[PDB]
Structure formats: C-alpha cells, structure tokens
From a paper:
Bacillus subtilis expresses TasA (translocation-dependent antimicrobial spore component) as the major biofilm protein, which aided by TapA (TasA anchoring/assembly protein, YqxM) can convert into stable oligomeric structures to form the biofilm matrix. In summary, TapA consists of an Ig domain in its core and flexible N and C termini. TapA thus functions as a chaperone in analogy to the chaperone-usher pathway since it already has a complete and especially stable V-set Ig fold and has the ability to complement TasA in the process of filament formation by donating its previously unstructured N-terminal strand. Owing to the stability of the TapA Ig domain, it is not able to open a cleft to receive a donor strand, and thus can only be located at the beginning of a filament, acting as filament inducer.
The longer construct was investigated because NMR showed long-range contacts between W74 and the core of the Ig domain. TapA71-190 shows a V-set Ig fold (InterPro code: IPR013106) composed of two antiparallel β-sheets. D71 forms four hydrogen bonds involving residues G169, W74, and R73. W74 and D71 together stabilize the loop between β-strands 8 and 9. The additional hydrogen bonding suggests a higher stability of TapA71-190, which is supported by the TSA data (Tm = 60 °C for TapA71-190 and 46 °C for TapA75-190). Structural integrity is supported by a disulfide bond linking C92 and C188. Intriguingly, the secondary structure pattern of the Ig domain resembles in its core (gray background) that of the TasA filament structure and the proteins of the chaperone-usher pathway. The high melting point of TapA (64 °C), together with the fact that it already consists of a complete Ig fold, explains its inability to be located within a filament.
Author numbering: 72 to 189
The structure:
C-alpha cells in the first residue's frame, strides 16, 4: 500500500505503420522518472480494442501483468508471451496504490495494428 514514489511513463511501443502481419509480439517501454521502483505494483493490461478512436476505450484484456522487466537503470519493458492474432491493440498501465490524485489513474500506449496476411 506504500507508494515508493516511482513515476512510470510509456515512452515507446511497437510501431505498426504499414502492414505488420500477425503474429508479431507487441511491447511497450516505460521510463521511471520518480524514485527507484521497488515494491509499488504498476499493473498492465494488453487490450484487444474495438477501434483506435481516442481516447482509447477498454476492450478485451488478452494478457496482463505488472511492470518488472528492467532494461536500464530507470527503464522497463512489458511485452506479449501469447501468440498474437490480427486486430487493434493497446497497453493500459495503472497507477499504483498511493499514487497522487492529479490526472488519470492509468495511461494508454498508442494503438498497434496487426494485419491478417493469410
């Protein structure tokens, strides 16, 4: 329940410009600009979206987890382990317990599109 003063922002995600054929794994990279991430849980969900109209709407959660895979001093990655199918997707990352009450309780990635190439 203690907030460790971490502040994670989505910095990048899979670039699906043009035709990216399913299956291809999706990811997001997050930078922590706050204090070191220790015990605060930053939940994430990969949503299969109805569409990419902003602001993004909750869809079907097909994978989930917590931000944990450290790739730099202040940098983390979330990614898929299940086989992807054609559709439109985005990661939704939730503020941890005790996070300040300014702004949203979540952050979405940009939408990512996987084509049907069969």
């Amino acid at each position: 329940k203690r907030w460790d003063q971490s502040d994670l922002h989505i910095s990048d995600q899979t670039d699906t410009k043009g035709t990216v054929c399913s299956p291809f794994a999706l990811f997001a990279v997050l930078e922590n600009t706050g204090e070191k991430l220790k015990k605060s849980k930053w939940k994430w969900e990969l949503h299969k979206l109805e569409n990419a109209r902003k602001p993004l709407k909750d869809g079907n959660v097909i994978e989930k987890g917590f931000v944990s895979n450290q790739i730099g001093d202040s940098l983390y990655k979330i990614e898929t382990k299940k086989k992807m199918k054609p559709g439109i997707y985005a990661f939704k990352v939730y503020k941890p317990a005790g996070y300040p009450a300014n702004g949203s309780t979540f952050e979405w990635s940009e939408p990512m599109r996987l084509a049907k190439c069969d």
